[PDB]
Amino acid sequence: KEKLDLYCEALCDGFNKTQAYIKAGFSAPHAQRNVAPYHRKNAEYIQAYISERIGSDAPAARKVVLEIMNDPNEKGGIRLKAAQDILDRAGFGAKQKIELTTK
């Protein structure tokens, strides 16, 4: 279970099937076949690992959007859009909508 996690991290970081698979610690001579089955047997974990890796970088972008909202030297529209986004994360959304349908 540790080799598959390391393979997922290496594939997520260096975008290569054969290079990451040979970097896992396995046989070099057959690096085109066994790798498709190994990827086919752990698709759920690969998706989960890539999703959590993408999600773990959120604080840096949150800091970036907050800083652009408070930096006076950037265009005002960008600050307005950043403030709108962060306030929308705070929890204030849109309002009423009515539907008519009886046939």
Q: Of 14, 9, 10, 90, which is closest to residue 56 (Cα–Cα)?
A: 9
CB of 76 to a second copy, least distance (A): 4
How large is the greatest C-alpha to C-alpha distance in the chain, in angstroms? Answer: 68
37 three-class SS: helix
Tell me the per-residue interface mask from 27 to 46 with a second copy, x by CB under 8 A, - otherwise.
-----xx--x--xx--x--x
3 is a site residue for a second copy (CB under 8 A): no
- Residues engaged in binding a second copy (CB under 8 A): 2, 5, 8-9, 11-15, 17, 32-33, 36, 39-40, 43, 46-47, 50-66, 68-71, 74-103
